[PDB]
């Protein structure tokens, strides 16, 4: 039997927040960002958050955000209520959003997205793979980490097993971020596929996108400003549904470059910066890094720092497709 009422595609408002939460159970294994980000998304000037409604009720959501100086649309948040799946809803919503972008933003030439699902024949036919990073996910209680880290690092140093390597400060206000990310050699030799990936969001390295990044409260670290080889990027932690008790936060660190020892020392630096602000909370810390470094960093986190590995090796894929008419 066909549905009594038609689908209606509308721009999201704050009125639908609770309905959106109610269709989002279990998404991203409890690491879903949308509960914490929905209000922000509605304020973003180049973003359209589209809801599919049936008979006045929200059954699906998709975000399209225009970045890269008008040339790219990033697709995020695609989801259909569990009780409405398998009927083509996501396909219809994707088509509505793509037509909306083509109508309102004629300058958009490509769509981009990131995901960690295994790429099958269907993905490889439709998308280009721009780059990929390995994904390392660990968990810790912030207070417990802070209480033991001094002793841990002391024992690691006395044993000659590990001593933090020097790292260098990176100030956005001071211009260090722009001097790094606008360098053609940093783009070629450090950034994965010449792209900034920040908490799953890809940006071409341009001044326009640096303004967007500057507003997010990111923290950066580098091995050397004068001779950059490893650059790390920490996104401010945010609440996630995992655990159901409100105590969990997601701490995303993107690591760019090939020197595993510098990724280790910069990871430690970010943990020491961020954990004091999370006293009383629990942390899902997800590190993205060059694939050949994953085993080294997994051992550093598990054996060196005593952190619990949540899952085995997976990959973050940056995918791109051309816009067609």
Numbering used by the authors: 47 to 371
Paper lines:
Here we identify the intracellular NAT16 as the human histidine acetyltransferase (HisAT) responsible for histidine acetylation in vitro and in vivo. Acetylhistidine is synthesized from histidine and acetyl coenzyme A (Ac-CoA) by a histidine acetyltransferase (HisAT, EC:2.3.1.33). We find that HisAT adopts a double-GNAT (Gcn5-related N-Acetyltransferase) fold where the N-terminal domain binds acetyl-CoA and with distinct active site conformation allowing the binding of histidine in between the two domains. Our results indicate that HisAT catalysis occurs via a ternary complex, and the ternary complex is likely stabilized by the oxyanion hole generated by the residues Gly123 and Leu124 of the β-bulge.
The HisAT crystals with CoA disulfide were obtained in the presence of histidine, arginine, and imidazole. In the structure where the buffer component imidazole was found in the active site, it was positioned in between Tyr74 and Trp246 in a similar way as the histidine side chain. This affinity probably explains the difference in enzyme activity between histidine and arginine, but not the poor quality of the other aromatic side chain amino acids as HisAT substrates. The HisAT crystals usually adopted the space group P63 where the packing seemed to be dependent on the crystal contact formed by the second CoA moiety of a CoA disulfide molecule, formed by two CoA molecules covalently linked by a disulfide bond between their thiol groups, at the active site. The crystals of the P63 space group invariably contained a CoA disulfide. The first CoA of the CoA disulfide bound to the canonical position and aligned well with the other molecules bound in this position except for the 3ʹ-AMP moiety that was poorly defined. The second CoA of the CoA disulfide was positioned in a cavity formed between the helices α3, α4, and the β-sheet segment composed of β5, β13, and β6.
